[PDB]
Each structure stands twice: as structure tokens, then as C-alpha cells.
Amino acid sequence: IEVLNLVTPDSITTIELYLNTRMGQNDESKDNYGYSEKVTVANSSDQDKPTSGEIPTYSTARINLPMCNTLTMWEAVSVKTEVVGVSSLVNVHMATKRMYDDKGIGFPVEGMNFHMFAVGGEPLELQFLTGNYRTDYSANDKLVVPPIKHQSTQGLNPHYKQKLTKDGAFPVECWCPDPSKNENTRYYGSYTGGQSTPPVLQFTNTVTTVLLDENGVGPLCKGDGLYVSCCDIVGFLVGKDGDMQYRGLPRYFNILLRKRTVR
Amino acid sequence: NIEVLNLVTGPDSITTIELYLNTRMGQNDESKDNYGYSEKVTVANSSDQDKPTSGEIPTYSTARINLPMLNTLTMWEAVSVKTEVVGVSSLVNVHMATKRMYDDKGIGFPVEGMNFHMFAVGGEPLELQFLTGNYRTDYSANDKLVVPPIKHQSTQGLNPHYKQKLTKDGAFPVECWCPDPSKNENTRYYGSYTGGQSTPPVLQFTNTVTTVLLDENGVGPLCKGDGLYVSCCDIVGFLVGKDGDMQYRGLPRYFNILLRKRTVR
Amino acid sequence: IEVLNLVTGPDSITTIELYLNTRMGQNDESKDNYGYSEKVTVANSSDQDKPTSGEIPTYSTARINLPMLNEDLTCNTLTMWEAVSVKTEVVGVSSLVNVHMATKRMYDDKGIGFPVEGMNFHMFAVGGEPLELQFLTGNYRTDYSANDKLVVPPIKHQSTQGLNPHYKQKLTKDGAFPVECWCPDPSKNENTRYYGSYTGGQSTPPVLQFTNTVTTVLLDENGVGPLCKGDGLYVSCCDIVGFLVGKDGDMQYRGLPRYFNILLRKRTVRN
Amino acid sequence: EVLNLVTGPDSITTIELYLNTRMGQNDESKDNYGYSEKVTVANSSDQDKPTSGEIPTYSTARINLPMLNEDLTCNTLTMWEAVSVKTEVVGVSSLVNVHMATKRMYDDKGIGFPVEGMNFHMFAVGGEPLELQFLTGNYRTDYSANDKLVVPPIKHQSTQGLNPHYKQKLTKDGAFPVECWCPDPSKNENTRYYGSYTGGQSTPPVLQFTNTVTTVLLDENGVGPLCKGDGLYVSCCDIVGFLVGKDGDMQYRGLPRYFNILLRKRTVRN
Amino acid sequence: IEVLNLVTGPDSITTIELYLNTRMGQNDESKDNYGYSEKVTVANSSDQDKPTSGEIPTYSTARINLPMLNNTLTMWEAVSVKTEVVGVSSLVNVHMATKRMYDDKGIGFPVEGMNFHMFAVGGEPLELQFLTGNYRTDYSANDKLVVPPIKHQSTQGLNPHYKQKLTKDGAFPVECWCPDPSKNENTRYYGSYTGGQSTPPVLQFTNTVTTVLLDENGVGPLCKGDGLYVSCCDIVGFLVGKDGDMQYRGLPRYFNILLRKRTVRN
């Protein structure tokens, strides 16, 4: 894309949406919504076959935007995004393991934190990379995973790529953003690991993230499509008998766009 | 919402509002023992028998302040705020009747664990979204708590049919209500959470920090019907009794707000 | 105080240096355990919470006399000293590099002695009048009568576990106001700046910095610093860096001294 | 001796690449790739001889830049000057996995231990090999279980601090151990390197990934690494922690790194 | 000193480059425990607190002679420093003979616990204040340690009668000497402490960071008698032996200091 000038009233527009988490029980009408199923643990690396619904996936959505030598496209300028329902973590009376010889608080949701989001003019481009090349994903055929398995995929093998084109379908554990592509998408992410680690979270409606690149060009919405993706894991819920489930929270986006002429 | 015009200049164009809010950890009566704490935390046997006891549930603190009464109108516009947690030094106390370190010879455990700190300033009540860790939580032990009368599975995620307004102090549980980011155009909120079991509280206090409430366009919260809305929650951790029983501990918050006159269409 | 212009000329600025030693409970520099509290005790119940004499940290404070400015106190204008900035440091942080003291030790009595560790509390204030204090405690019933030299309210009440504005005081005495029940009153202190932090937990690593290259500006949003009433400069602080854990597990607060280097200038005020 | 920039079309160029991790099992056709072999522990400091493949090494590559063909007999020459780099750790999301054959929490009912503990992250971009200084926690370490490792031929007590007679250049991928080689601060004028270490036993890994951060490689004089012989040197190590096996066996886990480097032509004195 | 104009033009700037090796207690580079302390011992009681020889960390320091320079005189003025801790990557080693995780199947304990990092650059020796956690500490197992000749209860606080200047490498214990903030007008110092028992070390290394040494008036340390003084300490934790015995580990530090010629009144 050769980028021409901005169109100088009716030349900007806002898009609001939220994405609900995809931890593994992704049916809103059922119990454990917004959690994974019970986490299971492989007996050996060649019997690493997770149960259905115990694997978190990326959340994603495509939004439709309004529709010579010169053409106009929607340019994404900025985004205010925030994690919703952080305060739901101020809860230590649920049916959980508890502190101090069954006299103290219930363990709050705690441990692993993974927070990512992305905004672009096309689906987020993915790279396959996993901790265990032999992971068998066939307990849930709705997951999108490569048809073949190889030793090299525990590192970066560029023959194993994909595009985030489906909500609740791409496991975060084997797909990450492809840094060699995504020239038309902006992505930001963090991971805090460990076993019982304190979640450290913020929420405010005053923070704006500029999506313009180093030349003042935001993501350009191809075929007038805006692509928004995320994942937000805030820890594990610890059951009374020590069984554990991922907990994730939803994400909100407020995206400002403008009109931009291209060649 | 409101079509904004020019600022009013000259004398009497500025005013100030100073207040504090007391914590609402669950025992909220200032003449009862345990004021500024929750009652003892209890733990449900299963997720369909999740009924907290009366008073073990932290709620939001909030107040509405009447401001001076004043083609076009004039409204009070909130410009900035100096806000601080009060009584941080009270947590330097290890001689209370608590569990203690090192084979009963060491210090009392200080108040420690979960920290949750939020405050909001707006020209109307804080707009809320329901979201909970357990859609079945039964709040009927305390009929003063404001919660939805219908329980649904989808409220463990974001369901936008479950909204509310923060219009009563000491009644909206923090655990099920958060700021609605899809509204709150006329309010600024700021919040954080540090979890874990016995996590160190990390706290700061000073009278030298000003939070600017002006938005990207240089427009602060505009005070509808001459009302200013201030809300907060400040959990600093848990007090651990001798037998392991635990109570939330909260601290008060101070606000000093600067407001100016703004002309609107 | 109605504030006017700065006074210029070669006598317009002055500098004040001092340090304040810690007041952890054992506050006599000729005695053992100086710079620590006495052994911490633990109440049997909340209505028998009576700390032992010397187990309680208090604020360090001092009033410094400044050069006299006004001989005639019947003029339309007067001059006051105005605190512009302060360079302050915690002294002796390197002392915490010590794992050979008589302490509990790691790894079945073969490892290091526990270093001083746990709760940290750091605050300092510079003002032109005493730091104004608000009473707030974790236990309204706390009985201070083991040490009648502590300054505390004469009445107790449930409401003091929150903010009761009828329970206030001024920091007018070194080593006497307990940290656990007095904090800076944010509804006053118009003429003092304070800065404070707390890091809790049981065995928490202390995290401390020391340098001679950082200046804290004390001017407010309008460019006005603390104005020294009666030509008096008030400096206050507390610096708790953790607990020393004795061989049997008894524990003491440890504190460190603080240094202050303050720049002041002359300012004209209405009289 | 640096002079001014040159103008015109093709005064600029970009180089894009990634480097895979070198934790010990460095063969992409075999199991445990991207991990070390199980860590083993010496019985005494005079018998400290690690097994082959349990030892992390630096990743590195020389990249050929478009050739600057020119008369070598004149007053000036032209060099490629690295201006800036966008670099990120790839696959961070792979650490969101608690179902692998690992030790697990809460009396064998909870999650599998995620990859956790020691984190070591460095990258370097230069116009010649990264210059290395030898420094080890044990001077007696015996690397002779793997003769591919590049280490000094003699051992001396002084190598537990800085002995400047023990230096190297980082000229082979997967060969220079991290544990005994660090960047030499007394040289490397023509390289920029960045590093960090978070230690401890089971420490939460803290990681970020984005495509929006540029690292300026120009020094305080506005001069970037200058690529000798039209060669660009890129180096890294990204240890994200240990995998804990069911029985307590532990392996390093590392992750690949991406680089996108901007370079411009600069005139230098000949 | 009354500072006047800078000296301009050629040979008005110079650079100084050095490193300082750590002084953790075993400070003899030909011996096996170099760059560590001897094993830490723990006193039976505070009145019997006599550390063994070699288990005490001390400051590293050096004086560098600058080129001969000289109503008015010329002095060297330190403008900035680039400094880094060297050999951080050496802490990526969990196969040494040490205590280990998970019932003797897991990693060796890495070097961990207490971190203390400080450096100083000035035009005269760094001025010290005595302050200790235990006034009775008996240092006579090593009479090469420079400590006060007299002891008193008040030295667990700040007693300004107990001062020194950092004039010897590997001799002033870190546990009882700190920078004196009432002096050091002609030195810049920077330090941090992270304590705890087994705390993760958090360390950074880079050749791209410059520390400006000029004060608020644009004046850096002025090198009296053409002497530049550099001091540091870099403790990175403890090595835990198989039986639980522990020793301090330190790392060396590099400095690259830029100086300029400054005219001053005499």
C-alpha cells in the first residue's frame, strides 16, 4: 500500500466492542463459563493429550466498517482498551482450597497471567511454536492446529504458520504472533509465570494507545475489515481437592479511525 | 452527551471540594467493634451453596457532593484531584491478637495479602457492569446488598444486560460490580489489584501529587445538577486471627478536587 | 499567609543540614539495642492489647531555628524563609549487609543468619510548622499505659479504626508519637510536604536506594514552598527497614537514620 | 574515523532474521529441541564436569549485507551503519501450558508446573563479532564432555573475577557457554548489547512481546555500529526457565528471537 | 574550589578506563575461593560476635593518576561515567557442587539472596560514616580490616564522631561503613540494597548507558592533585553448598570516565 493523504467531517469514526474470554468452557449458557475445564497432566510427553475444553484459545472478531487511481481506506489511529471485571478477583469465599488449616480465606484466583491484544486491518498472523511437539489435540477437533507434527516446532519453524480467523479455536499454547509479518497489525503482550503468583492488574478509562507507526500510519482496513484479537488469563481457581482451572476475563476496545487515500 | 463551549474567566470561576470516604469492608458501623474490617471470611462447600455471611463482603464507598448553585448554561467542570490513602502507617502494627511467626515467639502477622485500590471522580454516578467469579453466589444473608435479582451462567463473563449505577454507599459488592468501560464518559476511574495469599502490601502516601481529570480534548467531568460523584475502594489485605480466621482490612481515602466553571450549549 | 514577591540579593538564600536518628523503641544511644525496638510481644486477645514499653516505633522530629529576619513586627510586609528543596537520604543501608549476627539461621543451622528483613516504612516531611496528624489505628482498644511518655488520645472509641476527625494532634515531640496510630492529616498540612511508603509482609526483602544526586522540589503547584512560622523549620521522618530475628525467634524492629539538606530562600508576605 | 551520511536512492537497507535457541539440545530433528539435557550437579568443585548438552550457549550469526563495491585507494570508503533494531522474543505464549509431563501442584491434583525459574535475556547488534570476557563461578569446570564448546585451554583461580588475559570473540553459533562468557565492556565499541538476569529457584518469568518498539543503535555521537567487510553480527540468549519433569529432573527452556534491523550508508575515512 | 571557564580545543578532554575486582573476603586471585567470601558463621550471642577472617565483604576502590596539568590552575573535571557489572551471565550455572532442588534430582541452587550494588566517582577519597547493626562486633580475627579503634552503643545509629575516608581497597567492611551524606561534595555515589534470604537477583548489563556526573550547577568532581577516585561494591547473593554452608558471591565492575580540563581560582 502506497499511502496518500488524509481526507479532511464524516472523516473519522469510533468502533466499540468487547470480547469475552475463551478459556475452554466457552458456552455462556453453561456452568464454568469463563473458565477452562479441570487441568490434567500428561503421564509422558508421548501421551500428552489434553482433555477437551482445558486449553485456552485466542478471542477474535472482525468488524465491518462503512464502505479511480486513488482509493479510500479506514485507518486505525488509536485504541483505549481495558480488562473488565478485575474486581471479580476480590473474592475469597468460593468453593476452593483455603488457608490455615481450613480456618482462613479461600485461595483467590492466582498464578499465571497472560495478557495480549492486537488491532489490525487483516487477521493477526500466527507462528506455530510449542513446548511439546507431540501434543495430541484430537480430543477436540474444533481446535486449529497443524496437520503434521515435527521435532523442530519446539523452536521456530517458518513452514508452520496460520492466521487468526476464528474465535475460540487457536490454542495460545502453540500459536503466537508472527513478528516477520503483521506489518498491518499492532500487537502487545505480556506473560507473568510461576505457580501461585499474585496477579497484578490495572483498569482505567484514561489511557490511549497510539496505533500509528513510526511514519504516522495506522493499520489500514483491507476490504473495510477491522480485526481485534486478545487473550487475558488472570490465574487459576484452586478447587477444594486441589483441582485447578484457568480463569480469564473479558476485554473492551474503543477504536478511533480516520479516512486515508491510497494508490 | 454535552456540547462544550468556552471557560468562564475572572474571579469566582474556581472552587474546591475537600472530603474523605471511610472504608466499607463489611462491618460498616463506626460504633461497633471490627469497624474498618470485614466479618470473618467463610468458604462455601460447593459452588451452588455459595452464601456469604452478613458482613464478610467488601463494598464500594461513595458520596454525592452538592456544589455551589450557579441559550447556554454553566456547569462545574472537575479539573484535577489530589487523593491519598489515609492511615497507611497503621499497618506498622505486629502486636495485635493474631497468628505469629516462628513457633509463637515472633511478630504478629501484619495485615497482608490482596490489595485493591480504586477511586473515581465524575459528574454523575459511577456506571457499573456486573461480572462475578460464581454466577450462583447467594447474597440473601444481607438484603441491603445491591445485586441483580436474576442469576445467570453468562455473568461469569460480560453480559451487557446486567448493569447498574453506583448510587449507594456500602451496598455494591466489589466482587460482582466493576466500572463499565462502555459508558462512564463523564467519570474518570483508576484502579489496581494485587492478589496472592500473603502478598506484601505496597502503599504510597503524599500531599504533593495531582491527578489531572481533563480528557484528551481538555475537558473534565461536567457536574450534572451541580452534583459531584466520588467513589473508592481500598482493601489493604487481611488480618489473621490466632486460630487462622481472616478479615478484610480497609483504609479511608481523602480527596481534594479542583473545579472550574465551563459554558455549555 | 498572603504571599508576595521573592527577595533578591546576596543574602537571599540559606542552607540547613541535619540528621535524625531512628526511634524504634530503645531510643537512648548509650544503651544496648539503640536503633531497634524491644522484643515484640503479641496480645492474647483484642481487649488485652497492651504493648510493652519500648516495643513501639515513634516518629522522629526536630525544629530547627533559622536566622532571624524581622526586628520590627509592625510593618505592612514581613519576610519569611521558604523551603525550596531538600536532598534527603537514608543512612547506613550498607549495615544490612550482615548475616553473622546472633540470629535464626538458614538450612538446618548451617547457612546464613537471617538478615534484617520484612516490613519497610519510609516517610519524611519538611514544613514551616509541626506536621499535623490524624489518629487511626488497627485496634481501638490498644492500651498504651506501659509507657506514659507516648502521646496518644485520652479516650478510646470504635470509630478510630476508621477516620474520626475529632482525634488529631501535632507532631511536637521526638520519639513519642506512635507510628501505628498517628498518620499525616491530609485535610491540613497546607504548609508541609510529606512523602511516605509502606511495603508489608512477613520476611519481605527490603528494597532501598542511597545517592547524593537527587533533589526533591518542595514548591507547590503555584511555586510556593513551606513558609517557616516563627523562623522555625520542621523536619520529620520514620525509616523502618525490617526485623532482626533472634536465635529463639524473638523479633525486633530495626530503623535507620535520615539526613536532610534543605535549601531556603527569603520571601515577602503580607503582615 | 566517521564522516557524513551519503544521499540518494538505496542509501538505506533492512535486514530481517531470527535465531533459534541453543540450550543444549540444538538439533531441530531430535526430541527436546529448544531445551537442554537434564541438569546434573557436581559432587565436588574438583569434579564439576557437566554432561554434553546441559549447558546453554549463545546464538549468533554473521549476515552478508549488499556489497559496497568501491575503489579502496581513495581518501574515503562507505560502510553500512546499523541505525536501529526491532527485536522480540517469539513464542512467549508457549509458556501457557500446564499439562505437559511435569511435576504438579497440590498433592498430584493441580496444574503441571509451568516453565519457571531463572530468566536470562540478552541481544547484541554489531559490525564485528561480540567481544567476550571469561568469568566463571568455578575455575575448575571441565567442559571436555563436549569438545564443540569454545573455552580457554588453561584453568586458573583468577577466572572467578576479571582476568583480561582470558578473552574471545563470539564467532560460532551454539558453542560459547553463557555461564563462562560475557560481553567484554573494555571493547565492543562497535557493538551495542543489552542484557538482564532474574535468578532464584522457581521465580515467575516476566516477559513482554510487541511489534511497536524500536531500539535506537546510534551512540551518544549519533553513530551506529559500522559493518566491517559488509558483515552484520547479531547475537542473543533467551532463557525463560526450567521445565520440571515428573521426578524432579529439570531442563533449561529457551525461546527464539526475531530481529528487524535498519541500516544506512555512511562515509568513513580511509 | 572556585570554578571558572572550561579549557577549549585539542587535548582538553581525556578518558579513563578501568575495572575493579570484587572483594568478598577471599581476595587473593591465586586461591580457590576467589570472588567469594569464606563460609558465613553466625554468632552465639551479640557479645560474642567475632566474624572469621575472610567472611566479610569490603569496598573496592582505586585511585587513578591523571595527566600532569599545571592565580588560576587547571583541574580535571569528571563529566560522565559508563559503568557495568561484569560476568552477570556466570550466574546462569546450576551444576556447581551445591544444595539442589526436588529431593536431589533438580537443579543446583543458583547464586541467590541479598544484592548490594554501589559505585562512586570523585576527585578525592569517598568519605565514610560508621553505622553498624551491632556495636560490639569484634573485627580482631582480621587486623587488616580498617575499623574504628573504639566501640560504643551509639554506633547502631549515626554518631558523627565515627568517620573515615575510603583509602584502601579490600579493607573497609560494607557492613559498618556507608557513604557520608554530610560530605562528599566532590564525589557522586549511587547505591541499592535488596535483602531477603533467597530472593532472586535482578541484574542488567549494557554498554549504552551514560551516567552524568555534573551537579545542578554544571560542575563535576574536580580531581585534586590530579587523582580520580573510583569505588564500588557488587554483591549478587550467596552460593549454597551441599551441607547448607553459604558464601557471598560478588562480581567485578568496569568504568569508562570522561574528563575535561576546567580552570579554577587559586
Numbering used by the authors:
A (entry chain D): 33 to 40, 42 to 100, 107 to 302
B (entry chain E): 32 to 101, 108 to 302
C (entry chain A): 33 to 303
D (entry chain C): 34 to 303
E (entry chain B): 33 to 102, 108 to 303
Text from the published report:
Trichodysplasia spinulosa-associated Polyomavirus (TSPyV) was isolated from a patient suffering from trichodysplasia spinulosa, a skin disease that can appear in severely immunocompromised patients. TSPyV has a 5232-nucleotide dsDNA genome encapsulated in its non-enveloped icosahedral capsid made up of the proteins VP1, VP2 and VP3. As is typical for polyomaviruses, the TSPyV VP1 monomer adopts the iconic jelly-roll fold with a conserved core comprising two β-sheets that are formed by strands B, I, D, G and C, H, E, F, respectively. We demonstrate here that the skin-tropic TSPyV binds sialylated glycans in a binding site formed by the BC2-loop on top of the VP1 protein that is not utilized by any other structurally characterized member of the polyomavirus family.
Following cell attachment studies, we determined high-resolution X-ray structures of TSPyV VP1 pentamers alone and in complex with glycans bearing α2,3- or α2,6-linked terminal Neu5Ac. For these experiments, TSPyV VP1 was recombinantly expressed in E. coli. The VP1 protein forms the characteristic homopentamer but cannot assemble further into viral capsids due to N- and C-terminal truncations of the expression construct. The comparison of all seven structures reveals that TSPyV VP1 does not differ drastically in its amino acid sequence, length and fold of the surface loops. The TSPyV VP1 structure superposes on the BKPyV and JCPyV VP1 structures with small root-mean-square deviation (RMSD) values of about 0.8 Å (calculated for Cα atoms of the VP1 monomers). The groove forming the binding site for the terminal sialic acid in VP1 of BKPyV and other polyomaviruses next to the HI-loop is still present on TSPyV VP1. With Y68 and L276, the equivalent region of TSPyV VP1 is similarly hydrophobic. However, while the carboxylate group of Neu5Ac is recognized by two hydrogen bonds from side chains of residues S274 and T276 in BKPyV VP1, similar interactions are not possible in TSPyV as the recognition of the sialic acid carboxylate group appears to be electrostatically hindered through residues D280 and D282.
